[PDB]
Symmetry: C2
Subunit: 531 residues, 2 copies
């Protein structure tokens, strides 16, 4: 289990929306705990837990009022401990979201910093008004408007790259780094198996607090109107990540399990790849920087050329001897079924789970959940955070309460675990076929050879000496075609259909002739051969 | 062999510059005939002969005044026959440049068409001046200025997409298509093995002769200032090429040798690929459209990401089950050594000859010839067309005459066949190593798997079940590095150095550990793994 992260099958749980175990309409930790067997049953061996920490919920958990406490409606620390134990019982690693860049403005540290408590005054970024009034500089929040908010009591502005309710922590202050590092080991000491480092490339800012220059586009006041050279990718962040990785490896050696780090950065491809490893290859950082290529580029009118080149954009730019990861949805993104269509969730899965490396599934993708736009109450991302759909009972089995924290999608009686489990030809069964296939050594450890077959068909061969070979084929067009896969020189003419998607011109267990493989609209198949 | 074109080792001969056999300073056909053994000796099995037809030389052979006759200084039709016979005796196919779009304005047809001879009047494109005067429409020659030239005798303009000395032939006239097809078979009957179709996508123009729209770039009067929707890629050409291919396939069956077509089009990638095959796969055209990717993109500051994505741009966009071809220079392009540097000619060769399919070598690449800019007398392409460099004698052995049609590059005593053959560490010996390696079944027929190894190293695996595997590795940086090739899952840790370029950190015949392969600046090696 030292190499578990190199071919993990990840599932992102959003704790407010997974399962409510006490009828208040809000998911909770005991609810998750009761479903860790379900996750293992569908082939998951690792979870990404979105932040369950105490939070005023201005950014639903990503604005943390206490980094050591559980949000009360989700449970307490003993509930968290029971979830860690039940995850490990079911063979599932638990990766906790870690929010380094900012705290809630209701955090004790910030309340005390506002009133100039000497213990915490410098925990945040405070600057006087500019000469002649106004913010200290022109920096703009990720969400628009000034990155600075005035506090009348202090007579100063504090920095927030995100909302004003998310004051940035001051990592130029070594006590800030030391405290957040200590908090990391607190959660490790409860059995956690790794961390996702949220918004990591927002950590440091220019020490001279200089104005950023204009981008050359966008209206004044818009985030995109400035070139963010003083507020993103400030390179001191890399040494912090590399140092944390070195502390995780040492902890891993002492405790006998492999602790991993993933980073979330929206950055240049070069700035992203430096989180894996320094340019000179002397330092290691994140095991797996988040890779959003499939969210960006698996689009409704993509062809196989664009799909392949999107995949190669990650792979070509990676450092050698590291692990790629792949993800199609998250708590920050519109659901796959709404983004690309119900008739395309199945081929997205087929691709997701057969690409080399680690696949990441957002809760509800396995029953083809859709955005419920009309449910939005608090946030533009509400539609992709509606309650998990478990059965056809009240509130889709998410809660006994008919009023849930966000409304359940109205079609839940057709798109839920119970109904789909009864249908051998459902997306749910397709998901399970694929995660079961991921256990095959060729999928875990084999080479990958991918090609187009004409510009509309994508094909991905996985091969490992001494093992059967597997060929994923996707039809990126909405019309039937019959194609010749003969450019894969080393495959036999006859192959077996290991997997065929719910609506497919193939059927699992049949043989096909790969010189004349018929693919239905948006088809996906995984073919098998003994070489 | 019916699939010779699928892994041909091509060599482009420029007849004026290859070998002068009679002391007038001009290359001739007898000179070429006497070097076909040299070509077979260095692993060439196919030649592209630049046009030797009668020509006033305003575009040095590409302005043809008699498509059935040889330019007198090059010899006559019996010399041509002797070259064909000696080519075949050495196992070399001869592909003849075919010039369909236009003739010289000294061709008898155009002379007669000017005076409105009814036999030839409609062989060219004649239109009255626009109402109020001026050319029929706004079309602009490829070489700048109007695509129309007035003739007072006719009181009309004739069309030339190239120089005014290259009037466009009128393929809307079936007699023109019949006559040019007749001429193809004339050369086929003399034993030629194929044709390169010059400037093929300029063949047809808008039948309404409508003005072309602006592109949005460039100054008025420049070629790049119009969107060439009426003068380039008019799709009627595809049917002409598909019909020619069908006629070549029939001729191939009757005569018992495989005739190929290659097409030269500067086009969109989509317009280029339609020369292979119709969109619906019902029609075949060129066996190999020219692929200039390596000329465009193997550049002084390229890295492995850019190099791989350039190769993938061709491969991704190809139709399935067709042959790729690769070329690094030509009679229209600055020579590799001047383009990228003398210290990079060797790694260009290594890549060129190990990519799947057919490689094309420009005469003189094998002795690292350089542009002689100061030799320019007639044409911007003169510097890359200087005489072939055979030995250290007068005029590099190209001629007994010190006055050659273009001056010989002044460094010829160091960069010539004779000197380099005596030096087993030379670019010439490296060339022969690679063309000998090309005859291995794995290179002719094996799969290809290519990757970056970090952003500066490109690696290309050729593998074929039951045969040894070969791994090409190129350092795109000008500094030494030691890299780990372990991402190629199925390769052994120990491999043999099959080829090492002249200045390399590896030596042929040594064993390397591919977890730590040291590469010198701009290195290139081919490693072998036994079965
Ligand atoms: Ca910050
Ligand atoms: Ca034309
Ligand atoms: Mg795994
Ligand atoms: Mg060959």
């Amino acid at each position: 289990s030292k190499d578990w992260y190199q071919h993990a099958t990840f599932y992102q749980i959003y704790p407010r929306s997974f399962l409510d175990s006490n009828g208040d309409g809000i998911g909770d930790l005991a609810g998750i705990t009761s479903k860790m067997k379900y996750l293992a049953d569908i082939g998951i061996d690792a979870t990404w837990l979105s932040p369950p920490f105490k939070s005023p919920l201005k950014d639903f958990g990503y604005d943390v009022s206490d980094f050591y406490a559980i949000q009360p409606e989700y449970g307490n620390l003993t509930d968290f401990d029971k979830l860690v134990e039940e995850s490990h019982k079911n063979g599932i690693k638990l990766m906790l979201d870690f929010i380094p860049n900012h705290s809630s403005d209701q955090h004790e540290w910030f309340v005390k910093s506002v009133v100039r408590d000497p213990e915490y005054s410098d925990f945040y970024v405070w600057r006087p008004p500019a000469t002649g009034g106004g913010p200290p500089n022109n920096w703009i929040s990720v969400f628009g408007g000034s990155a600075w908010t005035y506090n009348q009591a202090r007579g100063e502005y504090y920095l927030h790259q995100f909302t004003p309710q998310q004051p940035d922590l001051n990592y130029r202050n070594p006590k800030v780094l030391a405290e957040m590092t200590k908090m990391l080991f607190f959660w490790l000491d409860r059995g956690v198996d790794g961390f996702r480092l949220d918004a990591i490339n927002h950590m440091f800012e220019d020490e001279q607090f200089r104005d950023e220059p204009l981008s050359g586009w966008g209206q004044p006041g818009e985030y995109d109107s400035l070139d963010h050279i003083y507020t993103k990718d400030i390179p001191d962040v890399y040494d912090v990540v590399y140092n944390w990785r070195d502390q995780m490896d040492k902890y891993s050696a002492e405790k006998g399990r492999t602790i991993i780090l993933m980073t979330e950065a929206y950055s240049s491809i070069e700035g992203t790849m430096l989180y894996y490893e320094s340019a000179d290859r002397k330092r290691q950082g994140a095991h797996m920087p988040f890779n959003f290529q499939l969210i960006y580029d698996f689009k409704k009118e993509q062809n196989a050329v664009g799909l392949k080149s999107s995949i190669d954009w990650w792979m070509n730019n990676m450092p050698a001897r590291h692990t790629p990861s792949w993800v199609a949805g998250s708590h920050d993104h519109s659901r796959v079924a709404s983004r690309v269509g119900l008739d395309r969730v199945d081929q997205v899965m087929t691709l997701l789970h057969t690409l080399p490396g680690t696949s990441i599934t957002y809760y509800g993708e396995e029953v083809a959940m859709q955005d419920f736009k009309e449910a939005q109450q608090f946030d533009n991302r509400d539609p992709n955070r509606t309650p998990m759909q478990w059965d056809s009972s009240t509130s889709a089995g998410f809660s006994t309460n008919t009023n849930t924290w966000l409304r359940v999608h109205p079609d839940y009686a057709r798109y839920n675990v119970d109904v789909m489990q009864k249908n051998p030809q459902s997306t749910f069964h397709h998901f399970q076929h694929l995660t079961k296939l991921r256990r095959h050594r060729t999928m875990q450890s084999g080479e990958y050879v991918h090609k187009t077959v004409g510009t509309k068909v994508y094909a991905l061969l996985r091969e490992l000496r001494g093992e059967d070979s597997f060929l994923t084929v996707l039809n990126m067009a909405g019309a039937e075609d019959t194609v010749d896969l003969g450019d894969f020189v080393n495959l036999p003419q006859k192959m077996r259909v290991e997997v065929a998607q719910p609506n497919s011109k193939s059927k699992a267990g049949n043989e096909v002739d790969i010189s004349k493989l018929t693919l239905g609209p948006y088809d996906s198949v995984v073919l098998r051969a003994t070489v």
